[PDB]
Design a protein around this motif. Sequence first.
Motif, PDB file in Angstrom:
ATOM      1  N   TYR A  77       4.800  -7.773  -3.404  1.00 47.48           N
ATOM      2  CA  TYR A  77       4.868  -6.783  -4.464  1.00 47.48           C
ATOM      3  C   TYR A  77       6.341  -6.472  -4.719  1.00 47.48           C
ATOM      4  N   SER A 123       5.419  -2.954  -2.326  1.00 45.33           N
ATOM      5  CA  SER A 123       4.970  -3.487  -1.034  1.00 45.33           C
ATOM      6  C   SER A 123       4.960  -2.382   0.039  1.00 45.33           C
ATOM      7  N   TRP A 167      -5.582  -0.232  -6.384  1.00 48.43           N
ATOM      8  CA  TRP A 167      -4.505  -1.096  -6.810  1.00 48.43           C
ATOM      9  C   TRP A 167      -4.974  -2.042  -7.860  1.00 48.43           C
ATOM     10  N   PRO A 197      -3.293  -5.211  -8.904  1.00 46.28           N
ATOM     11  CA  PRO A 197      -2.262  -6.231  -8.807  1.00 46.28           C
ATOM     12  C   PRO A 197      -2.207  -7.092 -10.079  1.00 46.28           C
ATOM     13  N   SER A 233       0.775  -2.837  -9.959  1.00 48.02           N
ATOM     14  CA  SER A 233       2.036  -3.400  -9.503  1.00 48.02           C
ATOM     15  C   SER A 233       2.110  -4.883  -9.870  1.00 48.02           C
ATOM     16  N   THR A 267       0.709 -11.469   0.045  1.00 46.08           N
ATOM     17  CA  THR A 267       0.960 -10.953  -1.295  1.00 46.08           C
ATOM     18  C   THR A 267       2.265 -10.157  -1.315  1.00 46.08           C
ATOM     19  N   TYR A 305       6.578  -0.922 -11.668  1.00 47.18           N
ATOM     20  CA  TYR A 305       7.199  -2.149 -12.130  1.00 47.18           C
ATOM     21  C   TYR A 305       8.535  -1.850 -12.787  1.00 47.18           C
ATOM     22  N   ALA A 307       2.453  -8.533  -8.616  1.00 45.65           N
ATOM     23  CA  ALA A 307       2.055  -9.145  -7.344  1.00 45.65           C
ATOM     24  C   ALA A 307       2.135 -10.672  -7.359  1.00 45.65           C
ATOM     25  N   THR A 308       2.418 -11.251  -6.195  1.00 41.41           N
ATOM     26  CA  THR A 308       2.581 -12.699  -6.057  1.00 41.41           C
ATOM     27  C   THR A 308       2.047 -13.137  -4.693  1.00 41.41           C
ATOM     28  N   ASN A 309       1.163 -14.134  -4.671  1.00 41.53           N
ATOM     29  CA  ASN A 309       0.770 -14.755  -3.398  1.00 41.53           C
ATOM     30  C   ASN A 309       1.716 -15.872  -2.944  1.00 41.53           C
TER      31      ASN A 309
END
Length: 330
Positions: free
Chosen positions: A22, A27, A47, A49, A11, A20, A73, A13-15
């Motif tokens: 998604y 998510s 996963w 990420p 997927s 995180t 995605y 992903a972003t912090n």
Amino acid sequence: VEDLKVVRIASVATNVGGKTVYAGSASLVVNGAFPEELRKQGIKVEWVPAAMASVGPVINEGFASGKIDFGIYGDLPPIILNASKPTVQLVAPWGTTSNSYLVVPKNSTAKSIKDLKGKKIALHRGRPWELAFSNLLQSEGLTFKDFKIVNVNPQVGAAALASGTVDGFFSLFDSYILEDRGVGKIIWSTKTAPVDWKLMGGVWARNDFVKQNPEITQAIVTAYLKSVHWVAQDENKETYIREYSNKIYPESVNRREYDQDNVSWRQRWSPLYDVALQEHYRKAVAYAQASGLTRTQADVQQMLNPHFVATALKELKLEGFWTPNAENLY
């Protein structure tokens, strides 16, 4: 101590502030009952990420080397991969991920794209929403020729519009921030466009993986739709907004993305391989080649596999829960 099948799932992903994000669908699936339900089937999901621009060298590449099996995605990357070589199939569409928006400075004369002829429009070129922009231009008998296109990310583009450095800005729901700081106004949006102008994607499977493991692929799709059915009910819209949406942006911004849309909350999550989906994919593959993201055009038919959603909807008694969209005679 069980004998589990490892299934690798990617997927985007972003912090954000210790957490995180998604890309919407993921998510819900990473944080829902999905992993556990697959575990009962003898399947261990793993996963993978991927940061928002590792997508090529991690996702498309993992697909290419067979080191990834599934990927949740957007449609743009897998289109680019498939042009190079048929590699990956859509086995569960996630619905419509985003509207697009035309924003002009707060004090602007402009009321529709027509008024921006010969003007500066900030647009992140090579992004899925460029297709919606292209559509809109086509709809009103215009081309790129008729504008100075400033190629910038949404953040620079937002800053530029706020300055009056450009006369228009084409983007996603981040546009609403511009209204909130009182420095822009949205004058057009895909909330008034045909369903296919909206962004799409979903669960993509490695072709070789499917051919070898139809049963597992099915378990994944059935499990996926279970989660999607849960979020697609109105009582869970607020939970989605607060828990599983895009946390880079305030809840109200996320909430406005679904406000006053010509597609209902439930319909935004539709997994149907309807006429509007086919058309979006036909259109998207044509645009990918024309904007020079690919030399070739991917075979649309070989990239879409409706067999798993069909099996899943019968199995789950959800055959009438979504409704198919037709071709919008614009």
